[PDB]
Amino acid sequence: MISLIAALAVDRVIGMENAMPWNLPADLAWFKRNTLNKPVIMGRHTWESIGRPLPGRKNIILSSQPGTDDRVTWVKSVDEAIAACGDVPEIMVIGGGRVYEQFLPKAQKLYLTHIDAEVEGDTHFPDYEPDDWESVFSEFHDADAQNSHSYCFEILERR
Ligand SMILES: NC(=O)c1ccc[n+]([C@@H]2O[C@H](COP(=O)([O-])OP(=O)(O)OC[C@H]3O[C@@H](n4cnc5c(N)ncnc54)[C@H](OP(=O)(O)O)[C@@H]3O)[C@@H](O)[C@H]2O)c1
Ligand SMILES: Nc1nc(=O)c2nc(CNc3ccc(C(=O)N[C@@H](CCC(=O)O)C(=O)O)cc3)cnc2[nH]1
């Protein structure tokens, strides 16, 4: 099973200048809980944005060019990325925009955080078709001393 996980600001913005400008510790904790002990697939730009391997997960990086770090696994196509995960119950695709576009048609589940923040961005989550997806979990949180925007954790499953 393939799943996508992402945090979206207003208008589906996910990034700006290869960075995520906000800081929501509660959402990073949610990301960790839902990805730990699973393979994560990311594109090269997102690898560079994170800047290090994510511990406790098999890190698989898509790039058309040879890898430059043997602490992670490098693959050259979507099918190779999936194969490199092996026989696991759930593969987590962690972006960015161009990678999410390619894996969305193959995904059964979306883990989306909707952040009530306006962000100038240059990267968006794909414009998926809402009729294809059932919301099976949603949990709203107001802003607090640690998290400066309100946010909604949602899980959607392909109908
Ligand atoms: N808010 C969130 O949830 C979230 C999550 C992830 C990322 N982001 C943000 O998203 C932005 C990065 O997204 P992006 O769209 O620019 O880049 P991306 O999807 O991370 O990376 C694209 C790169 O991945 C490689 N790639 C993708 N598909 C491939 C394929 N089928 N075969 C081979 N290589 C492939 C290519 O690398 P080569 O050029 O080396 O061939 C391509 O240039 C950053 O701002 C980051 O902060 C946000
Ligand atoms: N909901 C969601 N939020 C995100 O921030 C997110 N980020 C990415 C890509 N970028 C990043 C950037 C940093 C870390 C990171 O430092 N994660 C730690 C945090 C642990 C914690 O704070 O409790 C990790 O071990 O996962 C993960 C992904 C992809 N999907 C996402 N999905």
Ligand SMILES: [Mn+2]
């Ligand atoms: Mn092929």
Ligand SMILES: [Mn+2]
């Ligand atoms: Mn198999």
Ligand SMILES: [Mn+2]
């Ligand atoms: Mn806000």
